[PDB]
Symmetry: D2
Subunit: 203 residues, 4 copies
């Protein structure tokens, strides 16, 4: 049974970049809905699993196939929002302060500067043509190299792709404050990105 | 724990339309690989389910998201092939004979002939731009109306769409015999399609 | 060069079901963005097509492939929003009024009633796990039968699937008013659905 | 108008790793079908582009949307197979020989050896659940780093992802010889992979 994570900060602590009103809806409604949905999907799985254990028919297997989609969507929503709240911080807690050490060295070697990496990430975020996410990741299969990937809907990065920074590009992440001006939101969010958490995930 | 279904015919019973060589590989290698993969994926999800119970973190949830792709692909392969073997028959068991009853009535009402429906399905099969399936389905949500749908890979039709005829368009279903001439296989398979089974599925709504 | 269509009503004409603030953004910002994007994508096709004619290399073919996504997305945005505005109307213009004729008869035959069809469509809209659309369509390949289909992003219905009603399930279509309660928006929109335009599409299809 | 490229080797030159029967069908039937399809899709799109120029309706835009799927699939099939033939060579033409220069340096930096890069690529290939490809790529957006990506069907790597080695995982690429034993084919193909072409692509930063 999963639960909404505690937040490290108050709803309004990321203003003016992300409003408190968005945070409260995003956290208490959207995220909570993925929590509930994920729990329901795993219960339904459990039941189907027992059922198939005693009656391993094609019909029952098809029934499981049906639930897989909800496990993926709600699991993805749950995990992605947990990641998101953890890589956000108010400036008083280090939000927007550039990373140090190994991550900073890697960013410098690959992208030239933090500014370049961020510019690339915002171009990726703008390029999500639908609902989705952008992730700065460490690829453990190619020598631990940084990349920026896009996912759609609540798809997430798994296995050898370690998420370092997750940025939400669903319209509900910004619409009440920015409406259609999503570029302004993509630009503004970096002032409250927690690069300390990014460095921790990198380690 | 699922297993390969019993076949209603021997591997060579669909000759010359589908070779015995193909049927033997298709059943004993491909379908068996789906059976194994589905069993493994389901077991792994049980394991991760307990792990998530003990420690309901985003990391463990992430792992479950990883396993669902395998449950979907292998589950889909298992179930789709089961449907497939059940809607094929040799001519001695009614393969290639036209459907009966309400299904035939539906086909006449919607397509005007069985030939129109088969032509539509073959066009759908040719249109699968990859590995996939075509299904003739009964749509339970729109008053039980017949339609033809494509899926890719091992995706299947679920919910309100009841598969009546599954046709496999993965290359392994025909390559040894027809090679690149997939149109010839799509054309030839209708001689061994079991419309008796299709009628049954139509009438049952499952 | 495609352009925004003229709306048959002012932005605030669908209240209280759809805010005028929403319609104004949805039309002037979002849809316009699809118009501009589609024009850009078609011109880029022209350019790459000449490029490919002069040098039909794998590299240039690879560029062609690259533009296809924008063609699909912006083309879809343009088309879908045109359909959308055309099947909405204020109640004063017959919004929410039930369909007549052949469409009405087919609906009764297939779904039992207009209410059952609307419920099915709302279930499909709720089922869009992401941004997307639902369409009520006439299927020309199976004898002209009605169906409800979902699409994601700006994917649309083509070929034998004639769109009769399109409903937008992207958050920008409802968020400023309904926020997370998308089900309330899905339920409310039918009060301004133009079923006469649906009937005309059905007969012409 | 695209055309079937010239091969740099005879159909039976990659035996016993890939049969002559396979290469002949793969080239003269499958790839040719992509050539024909891509030319036809491009023609049809030009036609609809003209019609749209005179009649900019949502209906015509819907027809355009329908065509672009064919442009994607056939364009992909065409490009992916051109890549494929160019990164294959018989052993006497240097197939199976390790890459040199900048590519070799990058490979040893990120993977330690060609060994592990090939192992990674084989796991990716086995992981294609349907028809598709694996590509060893140079990512131009992250400082030029190597990676291995999967695509399904005739999807291809575009933009910052530059294909260095393309391996075909469609069943027609191996079934006549290996049937269901796809891992045997993925293992065997490396004996006739042309790393000199891969190095040329890495150095050039494009195909
Ligand atoms: Mn969100
Ligand atoms: Mn099969
Ligand atoms: Mn919209
Ligand atoms: Mn191929």
């Amino acid at each position: 049974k999963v639960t909404l994570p505690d937040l490290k900060w108050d709803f309004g602590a990321l203003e003016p970049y992300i409003s408190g009103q968005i945070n409260e809806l995003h956290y208490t409604k959207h995220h909570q809905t993925f929590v509930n949905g994920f729990n329901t999907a795993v219960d339904q799985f459990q039941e189907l699993s027992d059922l198939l254990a005693k009656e391993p028919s094609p019909a029952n297997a098809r029934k499981m196939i049906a639930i897989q989609q909800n496990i993926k969507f709600h699991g993805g929503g749950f995990t992605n929002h947990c990641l998101f709240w953890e890589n956000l911080a108010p400036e008083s807690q280090g939000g927007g302060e550039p990373p140090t050490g190994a991550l900073a060295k890697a960013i410098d070697e690959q992208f030239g500067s933090l500014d370049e990496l961020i510019k690339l990430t915002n171009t990726k975020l703008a390029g999500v043509q639908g609902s989705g996410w952008a992730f700065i990741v460490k690829n453990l299969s190619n020598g631990g190299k940084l990349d920026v990937v896009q996912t759609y809907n609540q798809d997430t990065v798994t296995g050898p792709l370690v998420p370092l920074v997750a940025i939400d590009a669903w319209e509900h992440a910004y619409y009440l404050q920015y409406q259609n001006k999503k570029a302004d939101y993509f630009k503004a969010i970096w002032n409250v990105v927690n690069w300390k958490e990014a460095s921790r995930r990198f380690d």
